[PDB]
Amino acid sequence: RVTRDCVQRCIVEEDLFLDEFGIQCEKADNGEKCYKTRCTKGCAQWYRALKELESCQEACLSLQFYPYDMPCIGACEMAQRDYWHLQRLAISHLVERTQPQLERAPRADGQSTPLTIRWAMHFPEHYLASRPFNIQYQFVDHHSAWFNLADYDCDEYYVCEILEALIPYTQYRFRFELPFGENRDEVLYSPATPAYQTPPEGAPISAPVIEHLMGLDDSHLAVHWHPGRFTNGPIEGYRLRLSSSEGNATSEQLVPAGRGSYIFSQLQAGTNYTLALSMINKQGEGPVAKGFVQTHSARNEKPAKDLTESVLLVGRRAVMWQSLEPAGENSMIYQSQEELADIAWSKREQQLWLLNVHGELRSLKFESGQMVSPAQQLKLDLGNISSGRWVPRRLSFDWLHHRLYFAMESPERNQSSFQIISTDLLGESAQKVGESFDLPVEQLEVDALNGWIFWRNEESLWRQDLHGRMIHRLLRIRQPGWFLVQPQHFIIHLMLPQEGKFLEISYDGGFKHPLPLPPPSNSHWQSFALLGRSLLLPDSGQLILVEQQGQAASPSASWPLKNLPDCWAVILLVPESQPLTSAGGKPHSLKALLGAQAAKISWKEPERNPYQSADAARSWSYELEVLDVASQSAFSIRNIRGPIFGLQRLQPDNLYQLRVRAINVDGEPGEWTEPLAARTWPLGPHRLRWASRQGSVIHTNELGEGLEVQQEQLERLPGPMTMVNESVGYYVTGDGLLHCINLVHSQWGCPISEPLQHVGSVTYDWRGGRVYWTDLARNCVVRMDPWSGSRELLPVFEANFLALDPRQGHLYYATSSQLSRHGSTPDEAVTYYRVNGLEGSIASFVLDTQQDQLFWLVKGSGALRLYRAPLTAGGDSLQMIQQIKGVFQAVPDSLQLLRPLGALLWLERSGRRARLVRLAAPLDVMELPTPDQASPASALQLLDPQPLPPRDEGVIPMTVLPDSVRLDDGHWDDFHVRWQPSTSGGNHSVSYRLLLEFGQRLQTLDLSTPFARLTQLPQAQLQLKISITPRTAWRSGDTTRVQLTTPP
């Protein structure tokens, strides 16, 4: 069925190959020494060879047509390729819809049988038993690297016991890798084996992943963690060890398995701490994860009772003002004849927001030096809310998002719900907040910085965000008292007068240890104020300032309140309690992209902690300094916003190691980030070509700006395209197909007007004027001349990625497993590096000819390793330059040298980013985002600003003169076929390929000398048909055909 294909391809391609030996078949020619006969022999012996599966090269040995039947090898190999494709279609059409399964598990009957596969038997001969294959296992991760087993014993049974070290307690998915063909995306798979979990029994190997280590409060460090990627046995707890940096105070806490946070208590303030997260299971402990954090620096008690900050004392009808300094003023502010509900507080403006039981909003701007102020009503709007009667009960002020939060009362009979609104300062922009509820509101306080609104009803302490999206419970007991959340400590101080507990519940509803409430020094309290660690307790008719140390309930200071014996609420009048912004979290993940004279610096916003909501205030001013390592010219650029910035006008002779700081809205110096490397002047202008998968080619600058699209369109999934000259270029597409295109004059005919299938990569040599492409069908390489269009074959086998060094003619080929250089002599063929069948395959390689260096890519199990090697020293300085972290695969052949920049450029599989590795600083991989007009990209080249040099005629050895072909004086059985040495204009070493035809026998010789010593000739005076093709290490000359007779 495929022999017809062989014959048709042979007759089509009979004259397409102009062999170097000077053999030429015309149509209807029955010459047996020529291409068609060898190809027919190849596809007649191809099946016989496949009986025992011998190599085509050794199957094509000819007893009369030495040394190599290259058309026979080609015919055999394409026969194998077509046969394998046909078998692929057959195996896909018959079944291929059956997965390897595990129905019976390792028993407890004393048989320790590991993974077993009992999978149906639909297989033909040959491919069943003698055919080897590989099995790879899939890692089950929901948010890894796929490896292949190295040990499995099985046969026609297909029950493969695996001694591979599978790590216990990790879910696996198995599958069969069936190798059909040589292309990466030309392989079929077995769909999926049902997920199987290997039994447990080992210590944990992964330390717990710590995701948040906030410095909550001054002495209440908190830590967030979860299971590590690996478990190794069921987990029953964790080991938390905290060690001080200046002391021996080490606290070790143990936590059951199910928990996602932990909080320590009673720590020293203003000192750096470290935390030891340990993952522990039944059989033992595991690794240790370390974290560095310093707790918030507290506010010391300061002048004992002399601080100038005041407090607002509130009674039934009073807004009394009092300051804590000794003999402080007790100036009364304002009186009302109705019952007062609560107050608010503004720091940016000395203005109060009073509200009685009837919802009368009275502005009470604290006049500078005068208590008397207008008490005008601030009648609110209700058209946008509802037409019913609405009387607010509790209110509070937001000092960052200038607003006024209220607790509303609906007029519903027997199911009167309560609601929150967010009006404007004058109270006109009514806004729906959250959902309705039936329990009455007793106190509303809003935390502006971290973005939360806290209220307490008779039962719980519901917490909400500024808008009303997330509502989360905090605590539910009987009749909670007063709480005084402060924005710079992340903890709430909840008082209970009946139980006398005075809790310290944290923001997430966890850490909840009560404190010793100070007993009265003579009753009940309804509020308090927090002056640092000291507690300000407003007793009735007496204000005590107690240093809260437990049993230290002694009044450090007292201020009579004989004008108000029924105080119920106190608020500390300190500017720190309403700060404009909070801790200056340093920017993280600094990234620098550099070009010729411009740079694109991108760095991420400081990460938020879970205690602050989405609507939390995060307004950030930025600044960035740039200094030279050598010149030390430092300059900082302020008034910058956004996570992305573009540097402009870098000065020459400079390195730009860079580091970025974040400036708070107040204007206080932030925390410096880590330094980052840079890059110096390459030369100047460059031109990168981006090949989009849709076929659009886009030219950009070094960074990707200055886009200049091209008017012409390429085919689907193109590869790097090689310029024959300034006009015509070759390229290879994703499915193994090449097209010849013309950039400027499309009407001009290409050297070959039909695209060629099954091609891997193409390269052009400027000195030889010939273009080479890797032919997977023939498993060899061919010669193409853009002018003549003739084909000549080069005996290089399994050639996948090609590159030619034009200086000395050595041809460098990269097979899938081994790398070597093919020269004019067998002794010169030196393998630079060889991989085995398990570590991976060569992905791409580029040749550096000015530096006499060779580079290549080695695809691995889960990472790609860069290498180097000298061409003059065989395998002497192999280096592991960069092992990429993560499963990032580079497109084959996409690796192209960057002579301006002196680096290597390859494109990842995604096609959205490119990676740069520089010779001077290999340890830094530079990202390059693909332009969106070209994303995703399939090929990236750097066009040399220098024009491609013209073809050099100085080579191309002159045709051997027919009159110069003579047989010099020797015996008829030992004589030299001597011709005048073909002279190349560059004095290059000329080699001669000799075709000798005598009778029905053909003798061929590859000679580095202008003479051929012929021995063992059967008879004297024989008529010898001599064909001489003078060849240099780069090009082949015209063939000379001469007939001679042996002289004495």
The one-letter amino acid at 347: K
The CA distance from 202 to 286, in Å, is 10
Sheet arrangement for strand 261-263: 209-212, 222-226, 261-263
Tokens for 1006? 């590859």
Task: Give the three-class secondary structure for 642.
Answer: coil
Please tell me the distance from the alpha carbon of residue 793 to that of residue 591, in angstroms, as a whole number: 49
Contact 276, 240 (CB under 8 A): yes
- Hey, which residues does 31 pair with through a beta bridge? none
Cβ-contact 322, 308 below 8 angstroms? no
d(C-alpha 941, C-alpha 479), whole Å: 73
Which residues is the chain interrupted after (C–N above 2.5 Å)?
143, 522
Tokens 């026979």 belong to residue: 72
Q: Where are the domains of the chain?
A: 3-94, 209-294, 333-581, 588-609+616-663, 962-1045
- Report the alpha-carbon distance of residue 456 to residue 418 in Å, rounded: 13
Closest listed residue to residue 214, CA positions, set 585, 596, 763, 587: 585
Is residue 903 within 8 A of residue 919, CB to CB? The reply is yes
* CA quadruple 156, 162, 168, 173: dihedral sign: negative
Kindly compute the dihedral angle of the four CA atoms of residues 114, 115, 118, 124, in this order, to the nearest 10 degrees.
-100
**How many residues can be counted in the chain?**
1048
Phi/psi at 58 (5° precision): -75, -20
Q: How far is CA 137 from CA 15, 256, 297, 407, 885, in A?
A: 49, 33, 52, 59, 20
Quote the CA–CA distance of 314 and 339 in Å, as a whole number: 11
Q: Angle between the 70-94 and 35-52 helix axes, to the nearest 10 degrees?
A: 50
The two three-digit tokens of residue 795, written as one number: 């005996």
The span from the CA of 62 to the CA of 48, in Å, is: 15
| Method used to obtain the model | cryo-EM
Strand partners, 997: 1002, 1025
- Whose tokens are 């830094």? That residue is 924
Give residue 585's Cα distance to chain centre.
Answer: 25
Q: What is the DSSP letter of 125?
A: S
Cα separation, 939 vs 8, whole angstroms: 35
Say which DSSP state 827 is in.
Answer: G
Q: How far apart are CA 430 and CA 1, in angstroms?
A: 82
* Cα–Cα distance, 127 to 501 (Å, whole number): 79
Q: H-helix or E-strand containing 7?
A: helix 3-13
Rounded-to-integer distance, Cα 892 and Cα 291, Å? 41
Contact 905, 942 (CB under 8 A): yes
Which is it for strands 209-212 and 235-244: parallel, antiparallel or unpaired? unpaired
Q: Are 629 and 657 in contact (CB under 8 A)?
A: yes
Angle at 811 between CA 808 and CA 815, to 5 degrees: 155
Given a contact cutoff of 8 angstroms between Cβ atoms, the answer to whether 343 and 384 are in contact is no
C-beta of residue 796 within 8 angstroms of C-beta of residue 822: yes
Place of tokens 């084996």: 193
Residues 6+ apart with CB under 8 A from 457: 437, 439, 440, 441, 442
> What is 962-1045's CATH superfamily?
Immunoglobulins (2.60.40.10)
Looking at 2.60.120.10, 2.60.40.1110, 3.40.718.10, 2.60.40.10, the CATH number of the domain 588-609+616-663 comes to 2.60.40.10
- Superfamily of domain 209-294, CATH level 4: Immunoglobulins (2.60.40.10)
Query: 235 in helix, strand or coil?
Result: strand
Closest CA to 831 of 801, 866, 876: 876
442 three-class SS: coil
Q: Does 209-294 match 962-1045 in CATH topology? A: yes
- Burial class, 456, CB count within 10 angstroms (exposed 0-12 / middle 13-18 / buried 19+): buried
Calpha distance 950→805 (Å, rounded): 16
Beta strands 621-626 and 134-139 are unpaired
Query: Reduced to 3 states, what is the DSSP secondary structure of residue 93?
Result: helix
36: alpha, beta or left? (left if phi > 0; alpha if psi -120 to 50)? alpha
- Partners of 647 in beta bridges: 599
Helix H or strand E encompassing 74? helix 70-94
Residue whose pair of structure tokens reads 């990202």 in the numeric block: 927
Assess contact for 481 and 516: CB atoms under 8 A: no
Separation between Cα atoms, residue 325 and residue 329, nearest integer Å: 8
User: Quick one: three-class SS letters along 838-903?
Assistant: CCCEEEEEEEECCCCEEEEEEECCCCEEECCEECCCCCCCCCCCCECCCCCCECCCCCEEECCCCE
Phi, psi of 618 (to 5 degrees): -140, 20
Burial class (CB in 10 A: 0-12, 13-18, 19+), 1028: buried
Tokens found for residue 557: 């200071």
The token duo for 882 is 């960069």
**CB-CB contact of 43 with 2 (8 Å):** yes
DSSP letter assigned to residue 496: -
**How is residue 926 written in tokens?**
């530079």
Query: Do β-strands 925-929 and 418-423 pair in parallel, antiparallel, or remain unpaired?
Result: unpaired
Q: Cβ distance 1029 to 21 under 8 Å?
A: yes
Q: What is the dihedral of CA 776, 782, 786, 789, to 10 degrees?
A: -100
Tally of CA atoms within 13 A in the half-sphere of 141 that contains its CB: 10
Whether residue 67 has a cis bond before it, omega within 30° of 0: yes
| Domain covering 333-581 in this structure, CATH number | 2.120.10.30
- 3-class secondary-structure state, position 425: coil
Cis before residue 487, ω within 30 degrees of 0? no
DSSP string across 253-288: EEEESS-SEEE--S--SS-EEEEEEEEEETTB---E
Query: What is the C-alpha to C-alpha distance for residues 571 and 1036, in angstroms, rounded to an integer?
Result: 98
